[PDB]
From a paper:
To gain insight into the structural organization of [name] we solved its crystal structure using single wave-length anomalous diffraction (SAD) phasing from a seleno-methionine derivative crystal. The structure was refined to 2.1 Å resolution with an Rwork of 0.19 and an Rfree of 0.22. The crystals belonged to the C 2 2 21 space group and contained four monomers per asymmetric unit. The [name] structure shows two defined globular α-helical domains separated by a ‘hinge’ that is formed by a bent α-helix. The amino terminal domain (amino acids 1 to 64) contains the lysozyme-like catalytic triad (Glu14, Asp19, Thr28) situated under a ‘flap’ formed by a loop that is anchored to the domain by interactions with three short helixes. The carboxy-terminal substrate-binding domain (amino acids 68 to 180) is composed of 6 anti parallel α-helices that organize into a helix bundle. The helix bundle serves as a support for a platform with a central groove, which together with the catalytic triad-containing flap forms a ring-like structure. Diaminopimelic acid (API) could be modeled into this density with an optimal fit indicating that this density corresponds to the muropeptide stem (or a portion of it) of an E. coli peptidoglycan fragment presumably bound to [name] after lysis and carried through the purification procedure. Comparison of the structures of the different molecules within the [name] asymmetric unit revealed two different conformations, one conformation shared by chains A, B, and D, and another conformation in chain C. These two alternative conformations, while overall largely identical, position the flap that contains the catalytic residues either closer or further apart (~6.1 Å) from the substrate-binding groove, resulting in either a close or open ring-like structure.
Residue numbers in the entry:
A (entry chain A), B (entry chain A): 5 to 197
C (entry chain C), E (entry chain D), F (entry chain D), H (entry chain C): 8 to 197
D (entry chain B), G (entry chain B): 7 to 197
Write the structure that this text describes.
Amino acid sequence: HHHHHSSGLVPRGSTKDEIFAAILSREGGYVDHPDDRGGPTHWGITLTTARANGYMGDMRNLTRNQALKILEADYWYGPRLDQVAIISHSIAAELCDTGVNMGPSIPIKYFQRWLNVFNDQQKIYPDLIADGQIGPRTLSALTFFLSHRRDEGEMILIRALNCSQGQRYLELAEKRQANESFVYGWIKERVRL
Amino acid sequence: HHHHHSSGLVPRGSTKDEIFAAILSREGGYVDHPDDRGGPTHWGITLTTARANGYMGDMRNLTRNQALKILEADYWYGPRLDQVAIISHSIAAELCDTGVNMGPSIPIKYFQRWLNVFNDQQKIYPDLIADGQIGPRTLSALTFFLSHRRDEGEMILIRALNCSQGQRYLELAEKRQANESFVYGWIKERVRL
Amino acid sequence: HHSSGLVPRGSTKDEIFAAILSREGGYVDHPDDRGGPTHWGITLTTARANGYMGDMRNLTRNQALKILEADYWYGPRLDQVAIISHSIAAELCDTGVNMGPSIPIKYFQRWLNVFNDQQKIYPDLIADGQIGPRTLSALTFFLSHRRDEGEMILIRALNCSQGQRYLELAEKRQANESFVYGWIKERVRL
Amino acid sequence: HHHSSGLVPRGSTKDEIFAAILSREGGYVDHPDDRGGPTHWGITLTTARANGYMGDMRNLTRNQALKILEADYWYGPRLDQVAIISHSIAAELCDTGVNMGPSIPIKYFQRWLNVFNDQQKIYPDLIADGQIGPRTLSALTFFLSHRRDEGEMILIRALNCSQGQRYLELAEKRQANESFVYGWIKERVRL
Amino acid sequence: HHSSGLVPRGSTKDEIFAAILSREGGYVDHPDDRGGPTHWGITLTTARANGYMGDMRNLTRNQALKILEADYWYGPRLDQVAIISHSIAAELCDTGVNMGPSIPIKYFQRWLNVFNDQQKIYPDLIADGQIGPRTLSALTFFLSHRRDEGEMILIRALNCSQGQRYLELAEKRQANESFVYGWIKERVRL
Amino acid sequence: HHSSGLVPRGSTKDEIFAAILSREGGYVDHPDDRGGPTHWGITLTTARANGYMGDMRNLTRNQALKILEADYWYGPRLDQVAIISHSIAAELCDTGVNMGPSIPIKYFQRWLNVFNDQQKIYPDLIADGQIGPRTLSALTFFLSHRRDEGEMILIRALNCSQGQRYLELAEKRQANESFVYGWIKERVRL
Amino acid sequence: HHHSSGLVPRGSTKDEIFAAILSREGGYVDHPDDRGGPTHWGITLTTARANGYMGDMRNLTRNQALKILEADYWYGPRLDQVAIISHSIAAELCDTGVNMGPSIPIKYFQRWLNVFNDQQKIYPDLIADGQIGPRTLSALTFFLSHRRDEGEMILIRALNCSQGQRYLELAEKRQANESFVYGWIKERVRL
Amino acid sequence: HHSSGLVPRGSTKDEIFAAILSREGGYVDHPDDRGGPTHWGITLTTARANGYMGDMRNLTRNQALKILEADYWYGPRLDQVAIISHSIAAELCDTGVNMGPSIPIKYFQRWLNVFNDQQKIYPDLIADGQIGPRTLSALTFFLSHRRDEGEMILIRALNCSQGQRYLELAEKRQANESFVYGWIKERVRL
Ligand SMILES: N[C@H](CCC[C@H](N)C(=O)O)C(=O)O
Ligand SMILES: N[C@H](CCC[C@H](N)C(=O)O)C(=O)O
Ligand SMILES: N[C@H](CCC[C@H](N)C(=O)O)C(=O)O
Ligand SMILES: N[C@H](CCC[C@H](N)C(=O)O)C(=O)O
Ligand SMILES: N[C@H](CCC[C@H](N)C(=O)O)C(=O)O
Ligand SMILES: N[C@H](CCC[C@H](N)C(=O)O)C(=O)O
Ligand SMILES: N[C@H](CCC[C@H](N)C(=O)O)C(=O)O
Ligand SMILES: N[C@H](CCC[C@H](N)C(=O)O)C(=O)O
């Protein structure tokens, strides 16, 4: 039943601020949706999402600034992409862009699985549990990966993440759970092979 | 295969500092364990746990202070019990005590399920996903629960958590995955009906 | 059953049954799709299963108490438990009224198996939900060392099982959330 | 586990059933550990301890063994309460109980009482839990009020049918002796 | 089948069929989803399957008897059993009419397998529900040890299988409870 | 069974059995897990199941023939089929000797069901693998429309079922590939 | 979906097989939407579009329909390549393919080639993928080198056996016409 | 297959096959439990399946190339794809050599189905892994609008499928982690 934000695309290299600015522009003000999709949004926020984040007011009075804090709570601070960003701005921004469209745990689990494959049979760091949750272990794994592979590793991990997402879009489009025009555009703007 | 710390009990009302101090005393220095249990510990830390948290040194040189930071990363900061503690010291301390014996996600999922039952058909706050992960939504749910039920609610939620843990200990003891003397002692010191 | 209101913790058998007869007092007719007619909280099927062949309108308060005692006390043999521990018997009776007597008796047997120390003190019981000589002998041997402490710990263990069961029932909408909150609240102690 | 060692004549009493076990399994008899191990008067170490005998198994008297058999196969299953309503049904449940475990024949007994209650006109359906309590006793009382002595004999033959078919299934899995099953049909089945 | 009335214990083949032809005599309507209308207890499907290509109204009592004997006597080869034991053949025929012939024949083969010791008197039969030379040879070798006792014991064993099956059918509402009670009653002996 | 050699297409019952008695003549050892030693192709289990209580060494060729005819001809009731069509009976017998008699009989019943239109010529048979009055009546009504064509077509249909089954057996290594190739080769026609 | 509308004589060529489809399904024929909808020269809208005809279905010529049948039932399955090695096997696969879809008979063909390779002495086992490529062609080449014309006839009769048994299973689920199956055994089965 | 070393991105068919023949050069004997003898990277089974009946020691480099082209080019019909798009054909060939040709062809078909716009541009293909007229016609219609862009996007989509497949293979220890890291590294672009 979960409303995310698979409504448009931001250019590659876009920051957290630009990702959330693009959601607040493309989904600005009141937009109706069916009850089975979280119902109507104000600045992209459903009543359930607003209440889950502690907005107890009338949804017609929700300001753009309050909506931004709610987006940041669900898609940046909640999943601890602020902590990822201290180690790698580009990995944090990629996880955030995929998180707003699929929900943050999806790309984080792919992230953990890819860090496990690149740890060289656990010589560089031990295998993570793919729980979808950024904590000290995942952050330490990313730190040791980037110490050994440097900036080449960063770019490779982003491409690896794009591969996981691309194949997920194939499976969703096949079950009619993703728009085919959207998936074609995503590959054109986000996939760097 | 996962080494936690179900080795002893701390008195009810014990703080985070006392919970971790008791682990460092009862599991002080080198203690051997079979390879299928994470192998040997130094200050209760396995080689895998130390490496996962970024200790790259020799396990015989791991200081008590470094071990404390590793325990706090896995059982306090990692699961965000520091954020829970800002709202309720007693709920954070209870989650921490159960977390060191079963692994933090177990008690956190029970915590989320109990907050869902006490939200009165989603009038006070919407249902959480029981993902085992403390983030803004779970913290906002605890904030609204404690605003409506006050200190009585806090104590009731701790007792509810004890019930979930007690029944889990029955199921573990039945599969020989928990010591029966330990479970008898746990009910005597921790269960306040 | 009768999950219809909270009884003070540690209520005796008589108070448990008195509280049912008060909260559900008096002949109240209902259509066939709602158990048919009730009297003193007894359904037509419960009365007939216990040998009342009369009109439900003529069921006396005294006959209703006998039926309750048969289904929730003598039937499950809590009279025999009470000879060893009136407190454990009263706790099994209160839970039995809410869930059906076999549920708490099975938790009781499973907990006695955990505390039998790898079968040194007594062998493992079958968790059949039936109080007989073996379950009674197991409770007797458990209480043999530290009677005071053992009784209190076993009741705390039964509360843990029942509390987790209330979580699972509330999650399936088979228990009222206010009831479950009140049930824990009544039992909070230091 | 149980006592499938011999047969007693049709119409044998509870006292005769237990006396026959104490004679055919009298004193020490060795058995392998995977069968409860050695018996004294037919009692395993586990059975004696579960019934509160804490002594040495070599000092277990015939009389203590009889109390343990009665606890497991008569008083525990509440066949004493059945016997007040029908001595012949109680004796038949007890004879089968000592061979199979008392819960097996009691469940068949409840299922047959449910069939003979005529779509719940005479009494409501029992839960077939294998446990004798006031409801099962009340159902037997109402069955025997409407069917009288004919019903009592009919219910015993119905139980014999359930037990006979169970012996077929057990013999097929090698969990019952075939000579025993042939002798059991010969002595006990009256249909 | 023909579960319609109780026949005295030990009825012959002729009496089993005579009883069906009397209790279901002439035209009797039944709903289309249950084989539709019967003449002398024979459905159109049953008649056609046995080579009756005429009109149901013109089906004689004598033609109906042949169809019954084909489906419940000659088809299952009970004529060959009858050469060895008329009383076993009559028992299998009575049960076959009620349940379908393969049910009692498989019980028959399973019981012959238990009474062959450990394949010392004869080897285990496949319980296929089909009477053939091996099943006939097994009955012959079983009866060569204590004929009267064996026949009596094997009929008692078959009665046990059939009685338990009546419990299972009554429980699924596929057999009338009065029928089952009357069936056991007719067979009670000392 | 007897998968041991290819017999000319359309061999009679007598020739099918004669070929088994020649290719497996006298004493032949086989491992205990495969029925053990044969005399005239008869295992001790097969002999005893058919009432031979003597010594295997004293089993005559003539006694072996009777056992073969009981298991592969009279038991499956191919004698009754032979009255309607000797060529269908001979085909079922040859396949029965190779696969066990119930396999080809069930294919036979399934094919009769397809060629009954929509139950217009005769009703659907249960594919139980048992030859009885209904299967015989269905073959009689099938053959009453174009006897020669029908017999030929039904034998072709049976050949199709059996050939596909040989593919499945060869794939599981339960049939020799040279055998299967030779089996089809013998039956190739224009 | 396919063309189970008629039979052609034994020994019919690919040209005759396709000519027979174009005659029995000539011009417009209505069919319900749940069966691919209406045909022109036996071609559905979906079949024509999948083969690159972008025009109006009413303007589809007999000759364009023939190219579409050949694409789906001859060139696509590579029966042209089979035909170089054996015209008679290619024609038999094509006749079955037009009724069932070409992959069904090709898989049976591969499974029978695996049985006749004599435990992989003459050629190794094929994957039964339903697809004609160099391996399946090489296996047919080596089979026909060791078995010659007898093998070719034997492999066709083996295919007929697989198809006949498949018709039994389809007729039983009401997915094939019984008169058609009877006529198919009569005309095509030569065993 | 040949997952044995990395080829530069966009390598042609000839370079893919040249790189196999260099990295796996020359007759190298192995025991029967390791594929037996290899020559130019061809196993005994691969050579025999492609019609080489000679001694593996005499296999020429030219014969090895023909076998590779049969299994990884002409066999899967990448020669026909190449007429429409040499770039897509080369990418399917490179993936086919590593995984088996049906894997990338099935991803290719599934991606063509996603980009057919709810079947407005061409109907959905069966993802059978077989390049035939329908798959070729679908690629032709896809490339009909924005040939340049479509080709590049379809190759990026195939890289996504193959990259995720390498994750799953590395997780089951069926792909080398250094290989997978190098495979992505070779393909990083801006
Ligand atoms: N695997 C840990 C928790 C993992 C937390 C992980 N998601 C992190 O990145 O810290 C455990 O059971 O102790
Ligand atoms: N349920 C959210 C994530 C829940 C995070 C939760 N564990 C928290 O307490 O913030 C979602 O899919 O957007
Ligand atoms: N003898 C029984 C044990 C269960 C009786 C038990 N519920 C009790 O007495 O407490 C049996 O072997 O099946
Ligand atoms: N076997 C018991 C009845 C079990 C009680 C159960 N029927 C309920 O009250 O839920 C008896 O014969 O009294
Ligand atoms: N006369 C036997 C037939 C069994 C044949 C079967 N045992 C086989 O040969 O496979 C019977 O009485 O069923
Ligand atoms: N002669 C039939 C017997 C079928 C009997 C079965 N159709 C039934 O009555 O239940 C046959 O040829 O198998
Ligand atoms: N059906 C194809 C063979 C498929 C290729 C496959 N056998 C592999 O190389 O993995 C053919 O007849 O050539
Ligand atoms: N007609 C085939 C479609 C698949 C052929 C395809 N793989 C191609 O040509 O690309 C069928 O109906 O089963």
